[PDB]
């Protein structure tokens, strides 16, 4: 029987039949090939397993044997799993730049990556310059932006201006990018986003031995611990260079630092598999952190 598979990227969907023993890799390979993506190291296929967990699809394993929720079209999302350290020197393909711009922006819009008011407006203008090209008195008439979801929700909730005010504001910033290309614009966007405190960092809800709530941030540059109340500022940091060994044993995870004088960090995950992922993420992420410091 043919296994029906849908793989949406951020601007495209793809639907084909799959073989009852097609390897995750073979699947990933088809998708990237069809899209014409070369920078394949940042990306993954994400599906949802039977327990409800969003999971990354493993390439060295039969795509049919990883327990993805069994619906008619087997559904996956093709998203960046890892983020570069510097967008401009790490994203060479227009395709890659595009799939990033989109994924990043979406999160910026969903209050996922925090972004303060002025920068939000600044970003929006780059997003509209990307969409619409040069501003034009004759074309873009008062309200030409009424249909576009342009600003982080919290931005709108906190600084109360009118809808047509925020628009005037972006319009002003839009008017100024006159001459930018759709491509450049998306890049100028990313260059600003990649500096946001929450950009390219995966959070996990944890608690220490004392049983108090915390967040663990795994990212391009290492681990970071946050207080539940603040997702932005790290309480303690651990770059890769300053970490010797990370391990877990059941729900208990432990970080061991390079200098012996430091009291190694210990936290408690809500389930075993949560650590499994934390371990997986760090490994893949550190690996790339090395790989871009060799030839």
């Amino acid at each position: 029987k043919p296994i029906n598979v849908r793989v949406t990227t951020m601007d495209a969907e793809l639907e084909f039949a799959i073989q009852p023993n097609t390897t995750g890799k073979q699947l990933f390979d088809q998708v990237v090939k069809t899209v014409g993506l070369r920078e394949v190291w940042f990306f993954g296929l994400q599906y949802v397993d039977s327990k409800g967990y969003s999971t990354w699809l493993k390439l060295n394993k039969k795509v049919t044997q990883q327990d993805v929720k069994k619906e008619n079209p087997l559904q996956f999302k093709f998203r960046a799993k890892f983020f570069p350290e510097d967008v401009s020197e790490e994203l060479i393909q227009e395709i890659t730049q595009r799939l990033f711009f989109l994924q990043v922006k979406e999160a910026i819009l969903n209050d996922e990556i925090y972004c303060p008011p002025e920068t939000a407006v600044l970003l929006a203008s780059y997003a509209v310059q990307a969409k619409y090209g040069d501003y034009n008195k004759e074309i873009h008439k008062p309200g030409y932006l009424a249909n576009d979801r342009l600003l982080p929700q919290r931005v709108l909730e906190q600084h109360k201006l009118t809808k047509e005010q925020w628009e005037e504001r972006i319009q002003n910033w839009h008017e100024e990018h006159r001459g930018m290309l759709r491509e450049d614009s998306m890049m100028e966007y990313l260059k600003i986003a990649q500096d946001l405190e929450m950009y390219g960092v995966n959070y996990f809800e944890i608690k220490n031995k004392k049983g108090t709530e915390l967040w663990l941030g795994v990212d391009a540059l290492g681990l970071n611990i946050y207080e539940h109340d603040d997702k932005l500022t790290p309480k303690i940091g651990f770059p890769w260079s300053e970490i010797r060994n990370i391990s877990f044993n059941d729900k208990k995870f432990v970080i061991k630092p390079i200098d012996k004088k430091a009291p190694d960090f210990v936290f408690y995950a809500p389930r075993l598999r949560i650590n499994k992922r934390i371990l997986a993420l760090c490994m893949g992420n550190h690996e790339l952190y090395m790989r871009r410091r060799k030839p």
């Binding site: 890769w240 300053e242 010797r244 060994n245």
Partner: peptide
């Protein structure tokens, strides 16, 4: 139970 060594 698992372990990884970084730096």
């Amino acid at each position: 139970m698992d372990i990884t060594d970084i730096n």
